[PDB]
């Protein structure tokens, strides 16, 4: 009863990419048990961004993942205290993005604080030149390890001609207090940018995430 059928959230991100410092403030809402959510993001410091929005989009919500009843919903269970996650994204051309995030529930609303550092993107690369057109649907392979929950993704960014820009993503999700971990399973994820102004200083995103068995 702690996680309602309809839940909102606030998100704040402090970040730097290739030395460009920035802040983003956002609000979101969705249906945590059917695995759907939207959010509207606002760059509030250091806008407009000299780099592609798409590397930030997956950092804005695992409480919103549809889970079949036979799989422990570890991250839903972690509330009200919540959980934290830590992520590295390794892109094909040497770009790296590391992220840390804290998730909590306060006054009926999810609170997300995000920290992001990105470096070593090539000046003539698609991220710094903003030639990316959003993510292909992906599959995160989840599994229990070291008492936490881990996720692995081979993620593809669409390139504006028919190619792709790839990234290897590795995340660790940790409940702030021990709750039941699941076995290995898969989460099909699709993230869409639904609206943005010209300089991507206001962005809206949609995401559907649904868990299923690996078998």
Numbering used by the authors: 6 to 65, 69 to 223
The publication says:
A modular strategy for protein crystallization using split green fluorescent protein (GFP) as a crystallization partner is demonstrated. In the present study, the protein chosen as a target for crystallization was superfolder Cherry (sfCherry), a version of red fluorescent protein engineered in our laboratory. sfCherry was chosen as a test protein so that the folding of the target could be monitored by red fluorescence while the GFP reconstitution could be monitored by green fluorescence. Our new folding-enhanced sfCherry contains six mutations: R36H, K92T, R125L, S147T, K162N and N196D. Also, previous studies on GFP have shown that it can form the basis for a complementation system: fragments composed of either β-strand 11 or a hairpin comprised of β-strands 10 and 11 can reassemble with truncated forms of GFP lacking these segments.
To allow subsequent comparisons, the crystal structure of sfCherry (without a loop insertion) was determined at 2 Å resolution from the protein expressed in E. coli. The chromophore is formed from residues Met66-Tyr67-Gly68 and is buried in the middle of the central helix. Unlike mCherry, sfCherry crystallized as a symmetric dimer. The dimer interface includes the hydrophobic residues Val96, Val104 and Leu125 and the hydrophilic residues Asn23, Glu94, Thr106, Thr108, Thr127 and Asn128. Similar to the AB dimer interface found in the Dsred tetramer, the sequence Val104, Thr106, Thr108 is central to the dimer interface in the sfCherry structure, in which Thr106A forms a hydrogen bond to its counterpart Thr106B. A sequence alignment of sfCherry, mCherry and Dsred suggests that the R125L mutation in sfCherry is likely to contribute to the observed dimerization. A native polyacrylamide gel at ∼10 mg ml−1 protein concentration indicated that the protein is approximately 50% dimer and 50% monomer. A homology model obtained for the sfCherry sequence using SWISS-MODEL has an r.m.s.d. of 0.2 Å for the Cα atoms of residues 6–222 compared with the actual structure that we obtained for sfCherry in this study.
